[PDB]
UniProtKB/Swiss-Prot annotation, chains A, B:
<feature type="transmembrane region" description="Helical">
    <location>
        <begin position="37"/>
        <end position="50"/>
    </location>
</feature>
<protein>
    <recommendedName>
        <fullName>Non-structural protein 4</fullName>
    </recommendedName>
</protein>
<comment type="subunit">
    <text>Interacts with PL-PRO and nsp6.</text>
</comment>
<comment type="function">
    <text>Plays a role in the formation and maintenance of double membrane vesicles (DMVs) replication organelles. DMVs are formed by nsp3 and nsp4, while nsp6 zippers ER membranes and connects to lipid droplets.</text>
</comment>
<feature type="topological domain" description="Cytoplasmic">
    <location>
        <begin position="3"/>
        <end position="36"/>
    </location>
</feature>
Length: 50, 50
């Protein structure tokens, strides 16, 4: 984490959350084909959390 | 963008807008031969925006 903070300057904070949200969305999309409940409730949770 | 900000010192801000305006003007000049309306209205918009 120190090595990561050495680069990317001030924008490391923006990059980290953008990557984490993308990873979470990718995981949700991967779990979509079996669990059909996710697209609605996860979207509502994301709207609440944002 | 971090790599670009590493160089050019304090004048990166002046260089960026100067390059963007030059690119926009070049695009407008490229669209000139077909759309004859551009030289006047774009000049007025540029004067307003400056």
């Amino acid at each position: 984490f120190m090595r990561f903070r050495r680069a990317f300057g001030e924008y490391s904070h923006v990059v980290a959350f953008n990557t984490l949200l993308f990873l979470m969305s990718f995981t949700v999309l991967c779990l979509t084909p079996v669990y059909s409940f996710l697209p609605g409730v996860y979207s509502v949770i994301y709207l609440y959390l944002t």
